[PDB]
Amino acid sequence: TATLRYPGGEIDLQIVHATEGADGIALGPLLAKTGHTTFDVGFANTAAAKSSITYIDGDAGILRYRGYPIDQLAEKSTFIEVCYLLIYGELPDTDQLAQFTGRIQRHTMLHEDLKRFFDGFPRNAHPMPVLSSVVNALSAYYQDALDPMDNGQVELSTIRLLAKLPTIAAYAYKKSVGQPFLYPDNSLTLVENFLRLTFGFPAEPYQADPEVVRALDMLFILHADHEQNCSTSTVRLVGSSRANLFTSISGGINALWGPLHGGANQAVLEMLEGIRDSGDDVSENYDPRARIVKEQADKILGDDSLLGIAKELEEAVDFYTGLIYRALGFPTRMFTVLFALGRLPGWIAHWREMHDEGDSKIGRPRQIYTGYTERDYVTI
């Protein structure tokens, strides 16, 4: 129990216990019973959900998916195994992984019309716009299984999203440059096949560099879930209205499209580019991922920053992931798209969770009204 005393006064609140981390003080019917609200910029101290998907403690600093630490999955799992784990909450036995992997492998081709629909975008349009556009359009082609309540339908569009979203991001890249779209090769991994779709020409056969593959696969594990989140709390809110799966991911994708969140990688490069386009090099808590990322960065290795890094190791992140992506040949305007591809499983897991609850109710936040109280006067 807690007790709260407000000018009207005064109230007792249940405490809800967390299997790890901070516990919650359950607001009741806070107004009334009390005619008062909490005010909390950013929702930074408010929790509206229970989930058992990702635990983090930065101070500690821990990141686990379903209890498993990130260093272990990064080093020992795969992006697909991680998709499975996050979504259904356990690691898969050999049959379960293969059948899940099989199910995704057979849904990677888009409807030819949805392929053609890329034709309407302008001559070399930025991929981030194209991808949000195309994801909303999915409901136009896969009307088939859109019922948020029916599962099996959720299952089929969970599959469709995990399979088709890399295909879409690879096509948006091809569109952003002049290049033909390729098709899925059944003989590749999803991640390896994603890399062909992105980088393959019809002028030659494509061989994925294995070091490249493992680097990308790992990096999607590192970015698979991180919640709660701007992006995912957005998937949660839209789903709140019982929006369908696609429409909720799209909202996650739109939230992701902003520099503070999804394009932080892109901001860093932008920092870098300027310098190379101006006179140079002058003056005026550890993440478990960060450390794994520096490691894979130092191997694979930007033209150039490294000075920057060395330079202020002397005198006084998202930074490393940017360099890597660029190192693998990804142009800066694919970074946020790469982010969504990796986060997709988390977006999905949270939405599914949200659905499986005792019953969710729609999101209805408050405000502190700070305006007027007046009468209409005719326009003269």
Ligand X SMILES: O=C([O-])CC(=O)C(=O)O
Q: Which of residues 194-233 bind ligand X (CB under 6 A)?
A: 223, 226, 229
Q: Are 197 and 184 in contact (CB under 8 A)?
A: yes
Q: Among candidates 198, 151, 209, which has minimal Cα distance to 170?
A: 198
Total residues contacting ligand X by CB under 6 A comes to 4
Which of a copy of itself, ligand X, none has residue 223 at its interface (CB below 5 to 8 Å by kind)? ligand X
Question: Binder to a copy of itself among 101, 105, 133, 198 (CB under 8 A)?
Answer: 133
Comparison of 15 and 31: residue with beta carbon closer to ligand X: 31
The 10 Å Cβ neighbour count of residue 297 is: 19
- CA-based radius of gyration for the chain: 23
| 59-88 positions binding a copy of itself, by CB under 8 A | 64, 66-68, 72-73, 76-77, 81
| 232-261 positions binding a copy of itself, by CB under 8 A | 233-234, 237-244, 247-248, 250-251, 254-261
Token code pair at residue 168 = 């879409």
Q: Does 367 bind a copy of itself (CB under 8 A)?
A: yes
Which of a copy of itself, ligand X, none has residue 226 at its interface (CB below 5 to 8 Å by kind)? ligand X
Nearest distance in Å: CB 343, ligand X:
7
Token code pair at residue 122 = 């302008």
Nearest distance in Å: CB 264, ligand X:
7
Q: Does 236 bind ligand X (CB under 6 A)?
A: no
Comparison of 20 and 209: residue with beta carbon closer to a copy of itself: 20
Nearest distance in Å: CB 227, ligand X:
7
Nearest distance in Å: CB 143, ligand X:
25
H or E stretch including 131? helix 127-141
Token code pair at residue 136 = 């909303």
H or E stretch including 99? helix 94-105
Comparison of 258 and 329: residue with beta carbon closer to a copy of itself: 258
Sheet holding 54-57, edge to edge: 54-57, 62-65, 68-69
First CA to last CA distance, the chain: 59
Distance from C-alpha of 306 to C-alpha of 321, rounded to nearest angstrom: 14
Token code pair at residue 83 = 């998709």
| 299-338 positions binding ligand X, by CB under 6 A | 318
The footprint of ligand X (CB under 6 A) covers 223, 226, 229, 318
